[PDB]
Enzyme design. Sequence first.
Site, PDB file in Angstrom:
ATOM      1  N   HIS A 207      68.814 -36.795 -47.325  1.00  0.00           N
ATOM      2  CA  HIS A 207      68.760 -38.379 -47.432  1.00  0.00           C
ATOM      3  C   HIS A 207      68.517 -38.617 -45.946  1.00  0.00           C
ATOM      4  O   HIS A 207      67.929 -39.755 -45.615  1.00  0.00           O
ATOM      5  CB  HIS A 207      70.042 -38.821 -47.971  1.00  0.00           C
ATOM      6  CG  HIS A 207      70.002 -40.490 -48.228  1.00  0.00           C
ATOM      7  ND1 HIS A 207      71.180 -41.018 -48.123  1.00  0.00           N
ATOM      8  CD2 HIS A 207      69.141 -41.473 -47.663  1.00  0.00           C
ATOM      9  CE1 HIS A 207      71.144 -42.299 -48.070  1.00  0.00           C
ATOM     10  NE2 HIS A 207      69.857 -42.640 -47.865  1.00  0.00           N
TER      11      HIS A 207
ATOM     12  N   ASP B 187      70.282 -33.320 -52.776  1.00  0.00           N
ATOM     13  CA  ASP B 187      70.672 -33.714 -51.378  1.00  0.00           C
ATOM     14  C   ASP B 187      70.776 -32.815 -50.303  1.00  0.00           C
ATOM     15  O   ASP B 187      71.850 -32.344 -50.048  1.00  0.00           O
ATOM     16  CB  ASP B 187      71.505 -34.834 -51.281  1.00  0.00           C
ATOM     17  CG  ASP B 187      71.530 -35.411 -49.831  1.00  0.00           C
ATOM     18  OD1 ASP B 187      70.580 -35.254 -49.031  1.00  0.00           O
ATOM     19  OD2 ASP B 187      72.493 -36.399 -49.703  1.00  0.00           O
TER      20      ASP B 187
ATOM     21  N   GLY C 177      77.503 -42.077 -41.056  1.00  0.00           N
ATOM     22  CA  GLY C 177      77.241 -41.300 -40.149  1.00  0.00           C
ATOM     23  C   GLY C 177      77.942 -39.888 -40.249  1.00  0.00           C
ATOM     24  O   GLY C 177      77.391 -39.104 -39.409  1.00  0.00           O
TER      25      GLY C 177
ATOM     26  N   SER D 289      77.083 -38.033 -42.903  1.00  0.00           N
ATOM     27  CA  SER D 289      76.324 -37.553 -43.947  1.00  0.00           C
ATOM     28  C   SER D 289      75.631 -36.194 -43.218  1.00  0.00           C
ATOM     29  O   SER D 289      75.376 -36.532 -42.246  1.00  0.00           O
ATOM     30  CB  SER D 289      75.397 -38.431 -44.934  1.00  0.00           C
ATOM     31  OG  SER D 289      74.622 -39.000 -43.853  1.00  0.00           O
ATOM     32  N   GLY D 290      75.144 -35.050 -44.043  1.00  0.00           N
ATOM     33  CA  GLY D 290      74.529 -33.938 -43.711  1.00  0.00           C
ATOM     34  C   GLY D 290      75.508 -32.908 -43.115  1.00  0.00           C
ATOM     35  O   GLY D 290      75.063 -31.831 -42.669  1.00  0.00           O
TER      36      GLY D 290
HETATM   37  C1  LIG Z   1      73.679 -43.019 -38.889  1.00  0.00           C
HETATM   38  C2  LIG Z   1      74.466 -44.256 -38.985  1.00  0.00           C
HETATM   39  N1  LIG Z   1      74.736 -44.860 -37.534  1.00  0.00           N
HETATM   40  C3  LIG Z   1      75.359 -45.955 -37.762  1.00  0.00           C
HETATM   41  S1  LIG Z   1      75.429 -46.298 -39.554  1.00  0.00           S
HETATM   42  C4  LIG Z   1      74.719 -44.841 -39.983  1.00  0.00           C
HETATM   43  C5  LIG Z   1      74.760 -44.387 -41.496  1.00  0.00           C
HETATM   44  C6  LIG Z   1      74.667 -45.450 -42.566  1.00  0.00           C
HETATM   45  N2  LIG Z   1      74.657 -44.573 -43.681  1.00  0.00           N
HETATM   46  N3  LIG Z   1      74.487 -43.334 -43.200  1.00  0.00           N
HETATM   47  C7  LIG Z   1      74.679 -42.304 -44.095  1.00  0.00           C
HETATM   48  C8  LIG Z   1      73.259 -42.145 -44.918  1.00  0.00           C
HETATM   49  C9  LIG Z   1      71.951 -42.626 -43.985  1.00  0.00           C
HETATM   50  C10 LIG Z   1      71.455 -41.425 -43.142  1.00  0.00           C
HETATM   51  C11 LIG Z   1      70.976 -41.801 -44.413  1.00  0.00           C
HETATM   52  C12 LIG Z   1      75.673 -42.031 -45.192  1.00  0.00           C
HETATM   53  C13 LIG Z   1      75.723 -42.410 -46.376  1.00  0.00           C
HETATM   54  C14 LIG Z   1      76.688 -42.341 -47.268  1.00  0.00           C
HETATM   55  C15 LIG Z   1      77.978 -41.661 -46.537  1.00  0.00           C
HETATM   56  C16 LIG Z   1      79.148 -41.256 -47.255  1.00  0.00           C
HETATM   57  C17 LIG Z   1      79.996 -42.576 -47.698  1.00  0.00           C
HETATM   58  N4  LIG Z   1      79.825 -43.495 -47.713  1.00  0.00           N
HETATM   59  C18 LIG Z   1      79.785 -44.710 -48.649  1.00  0.00           C
HETATM   60  N5  LIG Z   1      79.278 -45.792 -47.744  1.00  0.00           N
HETATM   61  N6  LIG Z   1      79.357 -45.498 -46.395  1.00  0.00           N
HETATM   62  N7  LIG Z   1      79.604 -44.272 -46.294  1.00  0.00           N
HETATM   63  C19 LIG Z   1      81.067 -42.016 -48.521  1.00  0.00           C
HETATM   64  C20 LIG Z   1      81.322 -40.891 -48.800  1.00  0.00           C
HETATM   65  C21 LIG Z   1      80.657 -39.641 -48.440  1.00  0.00           C
HETATM   66 CL1  LIG Z   1      80.960 -38.289 -48.804  1.00  0.00          CL
HETATM   67  C22 LIG Z   1      79.340 -40.217 -47.684  1.00  0.00           C
HETATM   68  F1  LIG Z   1      78.591 -39.021 -47.201  1.00  0.00           F
HETATM   69  C23 LIG Z   1      77.933 -41.213 -45.468  1.00  0.00           C
HETATM   70  N8  LIG Z   1      76.766 -41.549 -44.587  1.00  0.00           N
HETATM   71  O1  LIG Z   1      76.835 -40.994 -43.444  1.00  0.00           O
HETATM   72  C24 LIG Z   1      74.688 -43.178 -41.978  1.00  0.00           C
END
Ligand SMILES: Cc1ncsc1-c1cnn([C@H](CC2CC2)c2ccc(-c3c(-n4cnnn4)ccc(Cl)c3F)c[n+]2[O-])c1
Length: 236
Positions: free
Chosen positions: A44, A93, A186, A188-189
Site C-alpha cells: 500500500h 499487502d 505512518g 504501516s509497512g
Molecule cells: C505517511 C503519512 N504521513 C502523514 S499521514 C501518513 C499516512 C496515512 N496513512 N498512512 C498509511 C497508509 C498510507 C501509506 C499508504 C496507514 C494506513 C493505515 C494504518 C493503520 C491504522 N490506521 C487506521 N487509520 N489510520 N491508521 C490502524 C491500524 C493499523 Cl495496523 C494500521 F496499519 C497505518 N498507516 O500508516 C500513512
Amino acid sequence: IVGGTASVRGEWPWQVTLHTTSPTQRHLCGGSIIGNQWILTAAHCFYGVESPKILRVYSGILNQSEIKEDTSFFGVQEIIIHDQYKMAESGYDIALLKLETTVNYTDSQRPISLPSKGDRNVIYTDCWVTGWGYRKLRDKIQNTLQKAKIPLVTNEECQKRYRGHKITHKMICAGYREGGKDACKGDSGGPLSCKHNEVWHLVGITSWGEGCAQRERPGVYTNVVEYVDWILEKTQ
Ligand SMILES: Cc1ncsc1-c1cnn([C@H](CC2CC2)c2ccc(-c3c(-n4cnnn4)ccc(Cl)c3F)c[n+]2[O-])c1
C-alpha cells in the site's frame, strides 16, 4: 504508534524509515531489513509512487531530525509488489525493496529473521509494533521512533470485529480488547516483531485497521509466515 513510548538508539535495528522525495521529502512508511539488499514493507505504501527513483531508505535512524541533506541513504533498485495486491484491506499487502547496494550490518542496522514454517504452531506472547506514526488519529509524524507491546488476537476473534472484511489466514491481528495501544498513520509497512527463545522474528507487517487503538478493533497485519515462500523466491 498510539499508547507507545520512545525507543532508544540501537533498540530496533531492523527498522527503517522509507522516505519519498516527491513533491517534498518526508517519511512515507516503515520497513524491515531482512537481507543485506532487501527491505520488507507494505504494498500500500507505493500508491502514487511514480517509480523507485523518488525513494530513499534510511537505516540506523532513531529521530527523524537526524536526517539532513548529507545523511547517507540507500537507493531503491526495484519495488516488488505481490502480484495479487489490490488494496490493503483485501490482503497481499506485502512488498520487497531491492536496494542499490548492500547494507553493512552494524549495531544500528541489523536484519530480522523470518518466521519458520516449522514455527507456525508457536504462540507468540512477546510482540511489539514500532514506528514514527501518529500517536492519535489526527496527529503528526513523530520525531522519535515509538514502541508498544501488543497481544496477538485469534483470526476468529478478528473476523468477528471486522464482519465487513474477509479476514484470512494470510492476515494476523493484534490489539487490546479495550484499545489504547495500536499502530496508526505512518506506521504501516513497519514490523510486528515477536521475540521467541530470545530471537526476534518478523511476524507481521503493519497494514490496516478501523481507526487507531479503538476498543474491539484490532490492528491487521500481513501474516509474514504465509509469504515466506514468496519472499525466498524473489530474493533468490
Ligand atoms: C505517511 C503519512 N504521513 C502523514 S499521514 C501518513 C499516512 C496515512 N496513512 N498512512 C498509511 C497508509 C498510507 C501509506 C499508504 C496507514 C494506513 C493505515 C494504518 C493503520 C491504522 N490506521 C487506521 N487509520 N489510520 N491508521 C490502524 C491500524 C493499523 Cl495496523 C494500521 F496499519 C497505518 N498507516 O500508516 C500513512
